[PDB]
Structure formats: structure tokens, C-alpha cells
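Complex record, seven chains
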Amino acid sequence: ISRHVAIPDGELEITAIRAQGAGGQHVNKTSTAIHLRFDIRASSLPEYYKERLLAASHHLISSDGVIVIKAQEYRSQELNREAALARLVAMIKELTTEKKARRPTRPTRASKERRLASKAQKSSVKAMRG
Amino acid sequence: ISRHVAIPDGELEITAAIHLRFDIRASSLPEYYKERLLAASHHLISSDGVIVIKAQEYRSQELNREAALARLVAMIKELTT
Amino acid sequence: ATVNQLVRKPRARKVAKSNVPALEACPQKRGVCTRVYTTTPKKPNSALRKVCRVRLTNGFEVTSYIGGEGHNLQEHSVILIRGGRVKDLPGVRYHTVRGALDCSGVKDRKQARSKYGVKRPKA
RNA sequence: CCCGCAGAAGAAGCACCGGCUAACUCCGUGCCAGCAGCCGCGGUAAUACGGAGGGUGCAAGCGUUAAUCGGAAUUACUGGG
RNA sequence: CGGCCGCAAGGUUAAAACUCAAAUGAAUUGACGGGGGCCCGCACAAGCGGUGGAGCAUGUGGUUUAAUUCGAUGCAACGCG
RNA sequence: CGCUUACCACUUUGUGAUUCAUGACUGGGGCGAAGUCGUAACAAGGUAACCGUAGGGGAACCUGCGGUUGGAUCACCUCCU
RNA sequence: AGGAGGUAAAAAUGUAAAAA
């Protein structure tokens, strides 16, 4: 019902390095406007939903579950900062989706036409000794 | 990063040996998912939103109290997605 | 017909398919026996059949039938298997020998007790 | 192997009973539980599920499984289309 | 599938696993046909007056109720028992 | 006797043949129907069906060409002699 | 009695609303 964004201030490690690709001398030098976060598995906010992120095979997440997302879209670092915070809630909150199994099924009116069908063959099979 | 808290026991119209409860529409969960809640056609939900819950298999009174409430929150999480 | 055709190509003996490919000329076989579940028979009948999936000694995963009320198998317990189809659940063609290593006899079978492997109650 | 003691003492179960295939009723469960080589039996009277009584077969053996030939003139030379 | 042939499409030769107790032929009695032939009925046509719209009486469904007794509930139930 | 030479087995290397396990995924099949879409075929099945071939198309199937009968159907109204 | 012409129109499904 009630749900509110948490994003533990400080619990999420944030690093900053230079970008890739082409783009003059502003992308190889002071291009440290690019991010690369670190969300260890030791964080554990929900605790039990947490173990489902770890055993969950996926990219942008190592074997130890450090969760590393390298943001590279624009020059502004505050843009990739929010662009990353969005890719986390897009990865994290996309795996929270605990789809319902809710099974199985069962015949409702099979016996209402099948059983009457056989009962109609059970009466025809009387051809034998008089 | 999106702390979940589905707090039950609030605006309820739980009527009832085997429960037949309703859910009030004029409150609980706002317009973005309320319209998603008011746009479901499965004939369990009426044309108002005073939803006719017909939970009858969970025999006992207090059990069907929460089972129909379970029928409520399950229908809610499906329509709040 | 027409003998010259016959001397070139003799009368073909129909190589019949053996109904139970557990192991040819083999009366019984044992298995690890896993997967105890229940599925529905076909159009004529209507019930719930308790079946099992056995890993054979020669390595053949086949499904068998536990004939009787007595359920004495859970994901393990090695049992004995004999051939016999039940024809209602298509896919199964073997019977679990009731009176095996870990499969005991069924209770209250006071008539026809050789089958279901129940010994005689002296009283 | 023979003589002698000899309290019946110490010595009978197994399958099946709807038709095929010799042999029937009652009770409990209700297309549920289960049976079966084949057709199939079972939705509150089940001559077929379980049990009981009685019956039939065979016998220190009786069933079930597996395998071969037979039935199969459904590889037909004998003996087919 | 392999071989063979082919510009290609593909052709020719020809499996098995698995699955079912059926599948098939001729013919017969029916039944049905937006098949044909013939014939009848307020079936249609030619007319007249009605129901359905309104109010009320009465029966039913649904709903409600401590109970709204139960059964009937296409034609052939519903001013029915 | 030692040594030497030819031959052969184990071992070795490289490269083929065949067979058997296994492989993400993918093709089609059988089986389970208790769902969804349509109703193609069986009557002239409501466009006769089927066969081969080419193209088309969510599905059955549609269409063109050629072929087969394993297809139904001959009621009436005008008129000559 | 022989005979020739012409005369015809679109229409699915049988759990079908009753379960999760």
C-alpha cells in the first residue's frame, strides 16, 4: 500500500571516472563527470528480498553482489548521477516484481458431458449372450 | 530504495459466517493507480468500487475476515502495478 | 507370391516389438525411485493415480504404477519393478512390486494376499 | 529295507467367482477411494472396488512377472492376397 | 536421415521411437439434408381483433427475510398443482 | 658371448572414417483437453469434393492451371408439330 | 407423344454466463 523511496544516503558508494568513446580532449581528461557506483549485498534493506538480488543471475551485478553501474550518457555528472539512481531503481525495483504463480486448474463440467457420454456407451455394450 | 509498507486496517467496510465484505472507494490509494483500480472488468468488482467480496471457502469468521482482506490486498497489488 | 520373387526375397518374419523395454528377458529391476506425483487418466475413467519415476539400474528413466492403497515411497526408498500396463494413464507401463525392499504390504488385504505381498495373520 | 511303541498325535494353502472362463449373496465407500490380459466396473442396492459368508479351480504347491513356439492360413513352400 | 538426381522447387529409395484398439470396405434400418417429387394444417397468403406501451388483478424469476413450504420451470412451466 | 641387420607388439604423432553419448536453441509429431479463434470436410455442408502444382494467408484453408468421379440436381411457366 | 429455351435468395455454434 504505502511505498516510499529510501535510497540509503551514504550506504550507496559512489565513484567517478572518465568517459569512453570519442569527444575531443574533454572526454579523456576532465571527463570524470562519469559515474560508477557500488551497492554491496551487505547493505540489506528488506533482508529477505535482498537474497533474491544475489542468487539472481544478471549483469551490472557481480558474484559477490556489489552491483556496479557505469553511467555514460551525457557530459553533466549530475545528469548521470540521476541517470544512475534511475537505473538502480529500474534494476532493483524491476526485480521486486514477485509475480504470482497461483495455480492449478480443474474441470468444472467435464463430468457433465463426459460421464454422461460413457454412461451412453455403457448401455449400448449389451450385445452378448441372450 | 523504495521501502514497502502495505498498512492494512484502515478505511474498511468489512461486512459478514462466511464473509461478504465491501471496500470503500472514496479514499485509499490515489488517482494514478485508483484509475487503474477503477478500470478492471472482472465482474467481481462492480460499477462503483464498493467491490463485492464473496469469500466463502475460508469457513471461520476471523479467518474469512483476513482471507477476504487477503482477497482485497492481492487484488490491490495486481491493480497497483 | 510367384516363387522366383520368393527365392530372391524370402518370407519376411515380423520382428515384433517387446512391450516392456526395461531390459529384455528381465523379470524384475530395481530403481532409486523419485518424483511421486498424481495426474488424471483418460476419457473413460475419472480418478487420481499415484505414480512414480524410477532411475533404473541400466539407466532408464521410466514411469511406473504403485498398485494399491499403501503409499510407502518418498523421493527415495529403492523398490522392485515388474512389467504391466494400466492403460488408463498413457505413458506408464510398469507395476511396482508390492512387497519390495522398502515397499511394504497394504493393510487389511484379507483376500488375495499373495499380491500386495501380505503374509498371513495367524489369528 | 525289515521288526516294534504310535496319544491322529507332527503335516494346506493359493488364485478366482461380469463376460471371455467353472463359480454367488450381504455389508461399507459413492466417476471419490480403487481394479484390470481384453471389452470395460465405479455418480447411496457395485453378481467386476474393499470386507464377510459360501462356491470353483489346483495342490506342497499356487500365483504374478519375463521369454519362446502355439493359437496366427496375421510372411500363407505345405497354406494368403 | 544417408545416398541418388535436380538451376531451384523438390523428386526417388525409405526408417525408427512413441501412441491407439481400433482404422477401413460393402450393404441395411433409420434419421437428417440451405436434395428432388407429392400432400395436409389459421403454416403462409386474404382479412378481423388482440399482446407487447398504461393502470390493476394473478402466477414466476430474482431479491429480501427468522420463514418468505415444496414441486412444475422450451413447444407440452408460468389465472399450474 | 658381445655387436650388427630384417621382422613384429606396447607406446607416439598427424590425418581421415564410423559409431555412441551429450548440446543453448530450433522443426515437426504423438498424447492430455479442461481453454481461445474460426467452422474446412461429412447433405448440393450452404463456393461439389479430391489429386498434382504455384502463389497467398492467424487457422482450418483460399485462388490460378490441368485432371478424376470416390458429385447432387432434371419440378414447373411460354411454344412448334 | 418427340422437343428446344429459361426459371434458385446472405445465415456460425451446441457450457450455451457462472467462476475465481
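Note: Chain C has one domain: 1-123.
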